[PDB]
Design a protein around this ligand. Structure first.
Ligand SMILES: CSC/C=C(/NCc1c(COP(=O)(O)O)cnc(C)c1O)C(=O)O
Ligand SMILES: CSC/C=C(/NCc1c(COP(=O)(O)O)cnc(C)c1O)C(=O)O
Ligand SMILES: CSC/C=C(/NCc1c(COP(=O)(O)O)cnc(C)c1O)C(=O)O
Ligand SMILES: CSC/C=C(/NCc1c(COP(=O)(O)O)cnc(C)c1O)C(=O)O
Lengths: 392, 396, 392, 392
């Protein structure tokens, strides 16, 4: 009922319950005590029989979880030490040897490495499918298919999946659909509202917004999230989020809407500019009318995002020269920071892939990815302009 | 001369850090940053292409975590350290790296509840074979070694009954057959016991406990060879768990480590007095404290541990019934899990820390009904004695 | 010259100087060591001579100071433990027995109390003057007049001072002009560009933006700020800011432009709404055409701000009924949080005044002050609407 | 009464009142909200009547204050941003023009500068007396003597005052006794139990113990502490302590007894070593039988402390060479850290004095001060031994 910005500030917290504290106190405590051992045993017996209690759990983490659940429109949330923590805790819970996971064609490097060199080496079967192509996806479904996992838009080429289409297919086989919603955040896209079962985030990125914490979030139905908490997190990863970092993340979430509006406004201008430049061969930005999945993008995303990928005609050398000339944009991995960032993976940083896997899946050569920050657009334009000139 | 190793307390405070290299900051600055930037695109391919081949020295490693790691490595006498989000982070990152389907892991008979659950309901369900062996019985361990045995994993002393393994004995068997020995050294810390110096390959900690000392962070540490720690960093942590430690918490952990020697001295002094007191009170059936000659592995404890630790496991006459009345009358001790806190704690393993085990598994792996576990804290021993004294009275 | 948002994010820091750290590391250290004692002696010799040096000062604090100096367009900045730390350190440095200070007619309660019950009881003369009346100000000048101090807009009438007019007069008589710029922030108003010598802030408010730190800032000339640092702060108050809180304040400043845009947009809608309602006797909001100093406010402020003050018909009883009915606004003092706040200033934030002095210095009974937060405006409209119905 | 160590860990906190949190949550919030306005006005009515309330007060700071009060044996505590914050807030409250303050002959440099160049330029009269000479103190007393202020032992020569003897004189004449107890901590010396009215600390030093926060503490009667809070802190300094730093200080306090035991044990060995070395002319350590006030040290301090002062035969030249040679000790001001520190008081901590004021007030040009840390004593002896060789 209250609006997104209202919920991002207030959801799950009334100051009058914590001595009037306007900002909730930070529970930086590894443990909680009991009034009797009988009461203590009841807390662990509940958890031992699959029930999450909110007594032997941290109220700072609980509040972050409830708030993220509200923003994504899910039943329950789980906070973890990183995006990789969210992903691995989720998949280790849901998969066992002989199960199959159907994967988007393009994934974040460490997700790819986890799948191919981690869980995939313990007898879990993997298959990559184009998640926009529903007839290909339907034909890839097998009785072993238990999870469908993808990012949308897909890092780093912005390929989109048809989330409602995927969910419709999955539902015929009872398969669980997991969407990495890092790029969009719940402010731009809510995959659970389109039929996904679970969403994962690297909250290290836009949710934090300020580049100072590492964190992960899972949001979904109570039964799935409980199992990921009690098995994935507790037993299989130990990817515990610091209450300090959780509190900072909640601080970032309070400006999520305002930050995302600005990331998007800035990236729209840079995309319009780059699409016209002679040095630029191709560009991937969902807000351009020429984006191949323009219509699908606008069905799922309320705004076209803060990320741009493009390719320079001069290939790898031009890519390098462009990167090296940047003075305001920083040369770095990561995204979703106040500071604008750039990376040119042909100076390898989707490096978990071999050269042939990068070619087979959608990762190129003159390809530069920009995380457009919150700086004054006129300064960002000037920096991109002179770097483009230097790329000759 | 200058080739003398600085003492433990000196290293816990100074190792790896010279204020001169950070503008004279006496306390190292906290690198609370998710990412690091590059001067050129080429310095950057060099870090990531380099990380992929096998090596860790991505100079985009977090200096706060790196100092913590180097300091823990120095204290344990290992080549390299890795900092993680929790003790379970350290354990799972290690075992996910070292084991694949068809490998066998030999396990100590008694394990921390979530370690047991990880093994039996986690990695053991992905094709890794498990077998439990009494790691104090070297003949039984030898007999259990198979060509598929890849890892030997145990705690010493074990949570919660304080059963000991002969670490050098285990390591000798592991050298003959080829297995990697991993020791959970949480209870002792490097101040009391250094398994790597006894021939273990890797040590893991829940740094949440004594290393922190103050119960305000959750954290894990792995120490061992450069080769094994790099592998665990680059696969286990980076790909299989994501159990990343906050630089804020790493800095708090380092702060705690600066008083580790002084705190452990007081934990052990207090526990020795309390254990001697408890052994003489009418209501106590048995007491297991490594510092008493009644301790079943007294001489092994004396040999491996420089002091007998801060943990007491005991059992009242009255069984579990009296255990609950005793624990309920405590007024200074808190009823809580965890250990290695400044605050004294009392818990009941069978319904709390080892709730992950079934009842028959608890009977099978040496976890009794009636066991009361004390984590003896840093309070005035006369106050702790008075508290235990009055609670004993109320349990009668 | 880079834009405001760019400078709020980047000014004074290049990652390449701190091992590539994108976010500057937090120097949570009470002290710094010297390579030699001659080097150490030289540092202390510098500050005895009156000069400030970067070594033997904290880099986290120094960055915050440099960044605030850039945003206000001043030479030098100083960070302190609170707004009152900024104000007291400043006035303790600049005044001595027999000096006079001319004050705006209405001040923040603790500033008032400091002046009247603190430094004023140590032989410093005070006189209150309307700082929008240049002839009254000119008339009140004496050879002893050393400092002119005021807030603009002043709480909670929002009375504006003519900063450039006041400064012209001050330059003639050789007085130092100090402006408490808490309400506007450098994003809306830069009193140094209008001729002020020093600006002070409660950075606890909008600069932080998230209600989790207490902090103060002074900005002005190098010569003045050095004296305030070396005498007021080091000797007379000891109001030292934690590097942890300074880092959080910098995190807040990174979204200042975005947050102030939203605070202002929301406040405008509520002010316009309040003006059309029958329960409202009178409303003080700079952005309404009917505001008495509308033109002077537009000349000094780029936007009309996030603070609204107003009187209900029904006086104090209606005020109580309104406040006690609020369900989304919180009853609290403070301002400039993400959370919307409401208060009654006579019994709370100006409780340092006696009943004669509340009436003496334009502080009404029946006045309600709103700090309009960042929540969805439709939610804020709904809460104000239902609370007005409950006021009747 | 539970033991010191017990109280340092537990006093004032029951986990059961905060959902079983074993560590108290950190209230990192600038403000607190109200359930009604008349509730809010009751709190600020209370503060105008001189009464301190728990609501609109920070529970983290309150716990620190209660704990510090317990350890000193006092009724009430106050936490501030620095030791100078404690000192200034106290003296600004207690003194007015015409009042006389009697001072120990040797004070910390910024305390000296605050007195002579700050409050002493606002009409407060100052006189220095030897607080060990009770005849001379008695003879210096006047009816205008409002405050007697000293450190014991004094920074930096270790000269002591007989606190109970001074207190007797103060009671006869009607003066308030303020003792800076920074060097000893409550673990070694409790001036309130010897008749002092107030104690102040730089909690930056031993209480923190780890060199990572800046903080001050005042302890004394509820009557005095309330006045210092409501005037000195609220109005005259704004020296507000961060809840983050308060929480860290409480963390430090939990090991105070263990750290001080080690500091003192190391310092005794080092002092005994220094006493036998040919390069050393004189040493000031309370634990040596040769200390002029050995008997009074043993009466009044339970251990001789972690601080050593000594003079090298070769004067300032040898002092410099000694300092520059140290490899394990750091050259730094500050004290009470885990890390061992060394400095030259005349050019550093007492550089606010002129050359002639140092000569007059017992601050030699040749003095070296050591803050003996927690490192292995054999390592510290080796470093000192080589630096003594190098001093020639
Ligand atoms: C080598 S550091 C660079 C990391 C980047 N991204 C992270 C990320 C993760 C993993 O999230 P953490 O574990 O919190 O890092 C998961 N899912 C997505 C879509 C992500 O973008 C990056 O450079 O784009
Ligand atoms: C149910 S909370 C109680 C936890 C307790 N112990 C933890 C522990 C871990 C796991 O460490 P984290 O992941 O940091 O918690 C690993 N290894 C050992 C020998 C341990 O004791 C306990 O109550 O004894
Ligand atoms: C009784 S708590 C309410 C405090 C409020 N204000 C603070 C303030 C200060 C002092 O700033 P700190 O020292 O940081 O608090 C200075 N100058 C101005 C224009 C301020 O608004 C309040 O508005 O209700
Ligand atoms: C020039 S920085 C070195 C400071 C030193 N001491 C400080 C101190 C203070 C003031 O304490 P803060 O305001 O917290 O720094 C008060 N009282 C005493 C007995 C002190 O020693 C020093 O090097 O001994």
């Amino acid at each position: 009922l209250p609006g997104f910005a209202t919920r991002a500030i207030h959801h799950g917290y009334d100051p009058q319950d914590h001595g009037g504290a306007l900002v909730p106190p930070v529970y930086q405590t590894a443990t909680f005590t009991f009034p009797t051992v009988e009461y203590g045993a009841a807390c662990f017996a509940g958890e031992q029989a699959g029930h999450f209690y909110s007594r032997i759990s941290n109220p700072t983490l609980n509040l972050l979880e409830a708030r993220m659940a509200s923003l994504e429109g899910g039943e329950a949330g789980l906070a973890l030490a990183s995006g990789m923590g969210a992903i691995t805790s989720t998949l280790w819970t849901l998969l066992r040897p002989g199960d199959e996971v159907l994967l988007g064609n393009t994934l974040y490097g460490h997700t790819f490495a986890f799948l191919h060199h981690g869980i995939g080496e313990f007898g879990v079967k993997l298959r990559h499918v184009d998640m926009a192509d529903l007839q290909a996806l339907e034909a890839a479904m097998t009785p072993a298919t238990r999870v469908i996992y993808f990012e949308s838009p897909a890092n780093p080429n912005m390929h989109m999946a048809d989330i409602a289409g995927v969910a419709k297919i999955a539902r015929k086989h009872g398969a669980t659909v997991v969407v990495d919603n890092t790029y969009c955040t719940p402010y731009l896209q809510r995959p659970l509202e389109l039929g996904a079962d679970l969403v994962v985030h690297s909250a290290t990125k836009y949710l934090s917004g300020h580049g100072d914490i590492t964190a992960g979030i899972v949001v979904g139905s109570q039964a799935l999230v409980d199992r990921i908490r009690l098995q994935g997190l507790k037993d299989m990863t130990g990817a515990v989020l610091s209450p300090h970092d959780a509190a900072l993340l909640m601080r970032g979430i309070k400006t999520l809407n305002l930050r995302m509006d600005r990331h998007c406004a800035n990236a729209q201008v840079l995309a319009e500019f780059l699409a016209r430049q002679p040095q630029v061969e191709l560009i991937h930005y969902p807000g351009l009318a020429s984006f191949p999945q323009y219509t699908l993008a606008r069905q799922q995303m309320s705004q076209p995002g803060g990320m741009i990928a493009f390719e320079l005609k001069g290939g790898i050398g031009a890519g390098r020269r462009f990167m090296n000339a940047l003075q305001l944009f920083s040369r770095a991995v990561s995204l979703g920071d106040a500071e604008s960032l750039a990376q040119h993976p042909a100076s390898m940083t989707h490096s978990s892939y071999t050269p042939e896997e990068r070619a087979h899946y959608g990762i190129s050569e003159g390809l530069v990815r920009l995380s457009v920050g919150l700086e004054d657009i006129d300064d960002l334009l000037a920096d991109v302009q002179q770097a483009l000139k230097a790329s000759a």
